Amino acid sequence: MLSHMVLTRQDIGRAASYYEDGADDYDASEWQGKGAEELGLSGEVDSKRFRELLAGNIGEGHRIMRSATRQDSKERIGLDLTFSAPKSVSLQALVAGDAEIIKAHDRAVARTLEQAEARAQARQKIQGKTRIETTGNLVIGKFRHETSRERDPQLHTHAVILNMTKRSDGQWRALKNDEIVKATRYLGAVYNAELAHELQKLGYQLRYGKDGNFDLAHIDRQQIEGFSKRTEQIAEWYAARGLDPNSVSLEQKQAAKVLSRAKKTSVDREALRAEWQATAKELGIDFS
DNA sequence: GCGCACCGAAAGGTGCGTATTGTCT
Ligand code: NI
């Protein structure tokens, strides 16, 4: 699954909290992109530099970016592309404990982002005429997480693409995100294909469903739903309001997701894993 | 965006809208 969300000023607090969330059996933060190579960024994401970049401060001595933003409009700080694995894949990786599956997810994400980068663009005006240039470079902060809001195993990565890109003439500008945003479904299929390929190299058999999504063949739907509490909460909201999931409006969909949410409280990380294992036995899951 | 108005200073730049599957911010 792949979803996008344009980030604005009001989201600056959430964007930097991508450090606190998830889970810790684990390089869970990493830089990516030619634009990042350009600025001298590699390895772990330094939280201090990340905040400055979100604010439009490339550092080194040039001016704060994006001053051309209209005061009656919102300032954009980035674009979050969130990659999520199928439930069974999260289970095998975080409950049974297969570290090679974590790597399979990371590779799939990295390869998809390379194709999103090929779609990076910027604008440039010369004597009144505006032109769109395919830029090819991005600055990305990647944060891997391990739990859902209800604390079920949920392997995912928040790829935060910063609102900046370097043109042919050497000038840094805001990202024209059209091609990346409109290619979300296509990029989601790239992630699915690469993940599948990496899992098959490890020896797993896959079961394709109907949307073109897949789950490991040895884990069934009943067992999957037993580790999908949020999905259960969303389904109850629709039922209570008497709505048909096949035809709900966007407003109703967002309402079901947002309003059925409970508050995020912390957990004892070592104890949670043991709970998962006992729950898995209860559901009759054989990880063999 | 389906070329605009309004940002700051460059006969220059930006938001805006874009999206829509499930494991579910
Ligand atoms: Ni997360």
Q: How far is CA A173 from CA A57, A194, A242, in A?
A: 12, 31, 48
Structure tokens, A238: 């629709």
Torsion of CA A76, A79, A29, A100, to 10 degrees: 180
Structure tokens, A8: 């604005």
Torsion of CA A189, A191, A195, A198, to 10 degrees: 110
Report the C-alpha gap between A208 and A206 in whole angstroms.
Answer: 6
> Which residues of A are part of a known binding site?
145, 156, 158
Residue A28 contacts residue A141 (beta carbons within 8 Å): no
Report the C-alpha gap between A101 and A216 in whole angstroms.
Answer: 12
Three-state DSSP at A66 gives coil
The end-to-end CA distance of chain A, in Å, is: 26
CA of A177 to C1' of B12 (A): 20
CA of A86 to C1' of B1 (A): 36
Per-residue DSSP letter, A4: E
Q: Which residue bears the tokens 């989601």? A: A188
Determine the nucleotide nearest to A186 by Cα–C1' distance. B21
Rounded to the nearest whole angstrom, what is the distance from the C-alpha of residue A75 to the centroid of ligand 1?
23
CA of A170 to C1' of B12 (A): 15
Catalytic residues of A: 18-19
Residue A154 contacts residue A218 (beta carbons within 8 Å): no
Report the C-alpha gap between A49 and A55 in whole angstroms.
Answer: 10
> Which residues of A are part of a known binding site for Cu(2+)?
145, 156, 158
Report the C-alpha gap between A134 and A121 in whole angstroms.
Answer: 5
Report the C-alpha gap between A137 and A113 in whole angstroms.
Answer: 11
Three-state DSSP at A6 gives strand
- Resolution value (Å, 1 decimal): 2.3
Residue A81 contacts residue A2 (beta carbons within 8 Å): yes
Q: Which residue bears the tokens 């010369």? A: A126
- How was this one solved? X-ray
Determine the nucleotide nearest to A256 by Cα–C1' distance. B24
Residue A126 contacts residue A15 (beta carbons within 8 Å): no
Residue type, A270: E
Phi, psi of A283 (to 5 degrees): -80, 0
* Contacting residues for A282 by C-beta, under 8 A, at least 6 apart: A226
CA dihedral over A248, A254, A256, A257, signed as positive or negative: positive
Residue A213 contacts residue A192 (beta carbons within 8 Å): yes
Among candidates A83, A79, A92, A70, which has minimal Cα distance to A204? A92
Residue A83 contacts residue A7 (beta carbons within 8 Å): no
